[PDB]
Each structure stands twice: as C-alpha cells, then as structure tokens.
C-alpha cells in the first residue's frame, strides 16, 4: 500500500485555472486537519486567514509568477480554525525541456520555533 514522505507535500497543476492542488500527502492532511477531497482542486490560499500578512502572500505570488522557488514562513489556519506558522518551501518543477510542469511544496508547522 502507498507510502509517502512524512514531510507535508503538495503538488499543484499550473496548467489548470488558479493552479489547483492536484496532490496532497497524508502528512499535509494531518498537519492541516483537512480531508484530501477538501483540498484537491483548490488553490492553496484557502489556508490563509485574517492574521496572514498580505506581504507574504504577494512575495509568494511574485516567486510563482517568476517560476522561482521561495522559502517563507506564513500564518495559516487548520480546518479547526487554529492558527499556525507554516514554513513553506515552494519550487517550480520544470521538464528537461525547460517547460513548467508542476509546482511542488514542503510545509511544516514551525509555531514552536517562532513563538
Ligand atoms: C505548490 C504550492 C504550495 C503552496 N502552499 C501554500 C501554503 O501552504 N499556504 C499558503 O498560504 N499558500 C500556499 N501557496 C500559495 C497560494 O497558492 C498562492 O500562490 C498565494 O496565495 C499567492 O497568490 P494569490 O495572491 O492569488 O492568493 C502555495 C502555492 C503553491 C504553488
């Protein structure tokens, strides 16, 4: 049966409108309290909320638009509403031919480090 990295991971498909999540591993679903069918097909921004710094969101949007990687700590929210610091690593995935195919991320709850 399936096994995945124990680090939270998402893959999104930028060929679909709004770059939706197409894969979330069980580690991400454990981290955020969501079900796979609640996260797949959505842009990851649903994790943000009233405490999320708009500057962080713009830095991510910028890196994505540039197809560059970004490492950023951002305030996000579990399904329960519980706020946490999410250490986000986002990378584009480019084919050997150079064309953008996916984005992939690592996520980690770093609340205990920052608070
Ligand atoms: C692979 C990937 C993973 C992402 N993971 C998160 C995440 O965990 N939390 C978050 O707030 N945004 C995450 N984002 C960022 C949002 O999807 C979006 O790019 C960001 O909010 C900037 O765009 P917007 O201004 O349209 O919202 C991720 C983006 C990608 C491509």
Curated annotation (Swiss-Prot):
Induction profile: Induced after invasion of host macrophages.
S-4a-FMN cysteine: modified positions: 44
Post-translational modification: FMN binds covalently to cysteine after exposure to blue light and this bond is spontaneously broken in the dark. However, this protein presents an adduct state that is extremely and unusually stable and does not decay measurably in 2h.
Segments forming domain PAS: 3-68
Residue ranges annotated for the PAC domain, each copy included: 68-114
Function noted in UniProt: Photosensitive kinase that is involved in increased bacterial virulence upon exposure to light. Once ejected from an infected animal host, sunlight acts as an environmental signal that increases the virulence of the bacterium, preparing it for infection of the next host. This photoreceptor protein is directly related to the bacterium's survival and replication within host macrophages.
Name listed for the protein in its UniProt record: Blue-light-activated histidine kinase
Organism: Brucella melitensis biotype 1 (strain ATCC 23456 / CCUG 17765 / NCTC 10094 / 16M)
Lineage: Bacteria, Pseudomonadati, Pseudomonadota, Alphaproteobacteria, Hyphomicrobiales
Residues of the full protein shown: 28 to 139 of 489
């Amino acid at each position: 049966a399936s096994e995945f990295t124990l680090m939270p991971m998402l893959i999104t498909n930028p060929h679909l409108p709004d770059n939706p999540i197409v894969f979330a591993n069980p580690a991400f679903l454990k981290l955020t309290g969501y079900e796979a069918d609640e996260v797949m097909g959505r842009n990851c921004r649903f994790l943000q909320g009233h405490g999320t710094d708009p500057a962080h969101v713009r830095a991510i949007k910028s890196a994505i638009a540039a197809e560059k990687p970004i490492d950023i700590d951002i305030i996000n929210y579990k399904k329960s509403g519980e706020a946490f610091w999410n250490r986000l690593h986002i990378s584009p995935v480019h084919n050997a031919n150079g064309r953008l195919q996916h984005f992939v991320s690592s996520q980690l709850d770093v609340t205990l480090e920052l608070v």
